Amino acid sequence: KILHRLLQDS
Amino acid sequence: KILHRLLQD
Amino acid sequence: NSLALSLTADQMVSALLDAEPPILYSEYDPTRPFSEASMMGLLTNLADRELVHMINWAKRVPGFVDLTLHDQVHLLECAWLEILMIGLVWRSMEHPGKLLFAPNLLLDRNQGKCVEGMVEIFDMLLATSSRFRMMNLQGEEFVCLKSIILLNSGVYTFKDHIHRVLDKITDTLIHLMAKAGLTLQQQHQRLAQLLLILSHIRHMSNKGMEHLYSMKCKNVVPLSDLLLEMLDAHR
Amino acid sequence: SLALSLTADQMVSALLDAEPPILYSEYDPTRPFSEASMMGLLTNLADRELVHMINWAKRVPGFVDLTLHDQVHLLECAWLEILMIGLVWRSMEHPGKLLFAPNLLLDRNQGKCVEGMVEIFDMLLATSSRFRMMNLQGEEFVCLKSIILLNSGVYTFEEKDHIHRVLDKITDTLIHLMAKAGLTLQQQHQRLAQLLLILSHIRHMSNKGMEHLYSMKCKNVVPLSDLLLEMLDAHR
Ligand SMILES: C[C@@H]1CCCC(=C(c2ccc(O)cc2)c2ccc(O)cc2)C1
Ligand SMILES: C[C@@H]1CCCC(=C(c2ccc(O)cc2)c2ccc(O)cc2)C1
Secondary structure, eight states, X not given: OHHHXXXXXX | XXXXXXXXX | OOHHHHSOHHHHHHHHHHTOOOOOOOOOSOOOOOSHHHHHHHHHXXXXXXXXXXXXXXXXXXXXTTSOHHHHHHHHHHHHHHHHHHHHHHHGGGSTTOEEEETTEEEOHHHHTTSTTXXXXXXXXXXXXXXXXXXTOOHHHHHHHHHHHHHHTTGGGOOHHHHHHHHHHHXXXXXXXXXXXXXXXXXXXHHHHHHHHHHHHHHHHHHHHHHHHHHHHHXXXXXXXXXXXXXXXXX | OOSTTOOHHHHHHHHHXXXXXXXXXXXXXXXXXXXXXXXXXXXXXXXXXXXXXXXXXXXXXXXXXXXXXXXXXXXXXXXXXXXXXXXXXXXXXXXXXXXXXXXXXXXXXXXXXXXXXXXXXXXXXXXXXXXXXXXXXXXXXXXXXXXXXXXXXXXXXXXXXXXXXXXXXXXXXXXXXXXXXTOOHHHHHHHHHHHHHHHHHHHHHHHHHHHHHHHHHHHTSSOOOHHHHHHHHHXX
């Protein structure tokens, strides 16, 4: 999930 | 429309 | 040039409370409805009779009668399902986990599953009802919210009169909260909380409308000519 | 949290600093207008805006304190609403026109270029004209946008009370701004109500827009981006 990815990026 | 008639009543 | 603007806050409240439609009953001799046909049959019949009362209720909302006939038509066409829903949510307030469509018709999640793609609106409705009860929504606040929906929902699809009536209902809402002993901060916070609910009620209406449109195309449940015209007004 | 401890002016500052930039379109005034390429431009534009929105959301007070699953849900619900109120805000001083980008201004007779989109176009114009008449302030705008992010998906999921706490904090901030502008107590309440009723219409426009985008995907003529497709499936 892309939205999951970008939100999670630290 | 029916709505017309009912609003006039 | 409007008697609505001249009313005091209490006159506004008294007028709205007395204009309230009655709580109608569903059809009797029941099996607990479980077929997609019988449930939607009961609901359609109920909504159809409710609409007749809503139309005459709307005419008793201060400022609504000052509008042209065509403007009255447009507002009701836009807001009718919203008003039915916030009515349903209000009635279901003292019955957590259940929806009181009528005193003899209480439905829960499991009966929403009956109709394909129906339980999601149910959950939204149940959530809104739980939200109302936790806020301890009052009847005086409810009738203000419902009138706001009537005048607001279709106002941008057309006009200072409506906005000035809307402003006065806000005055009334604050007046009610101040009367209940709420502090200045508690007043505008609660006002904000109540009005944000209308955004979700709008969303529930739009999702419900799509479902009713689907039922029309399905042509299994016969819709009345009145509902067909209210439904056609959206798309 | 740290958002609850924030004063009203700190809230405004943090929100104003978190504002995403105004991205450019690929519009070529000399190139033709297929009106399937117009949607192509808009799709490309929105897809790039989403990346900035997501990072903008992470700077909205309180949002980070939420579980990742809830963060996903709120953006999935409100992304088009947020795109739309942004579009409306940019178009505020361009009456009868929508400013999708500094190089992309469109009016009514370009909205009909796409099937059943002119009404949504007129609703956006009405909202924009409404912000204009109200003389909506930038400080009030960023408050509204954050409210949409937190509110729009709050009844579709505990820690929902934390959202209500932050939502009340933004309400305090909004009132603070109005009292600052010299508005009387009656005027503050009225304007506050006026602003929040707009959100109902922005919700309506989003639902209508979401349906038009689903129709466009099924037609499969204007290809949606991978992110845009996932955001669209969220509403089903
Ligand atoms: C899908 C909608 C959401 C749940 C409740 C619904 C309806 C409804 C809403 C409120 C109410 O008091 C009475 C009835 C409904 C049902 C049939 C119909 O022809 C029109 C409206 C349907
Ligand atoms: C039907 C909607 C009406 C208003 C404008 C719309 C879009 C839009 C909205 C805001 C914005 O900044 C950039 C783009 C859009 C277009 C294509 C797409 O795949 C996603 C969104 C589309």
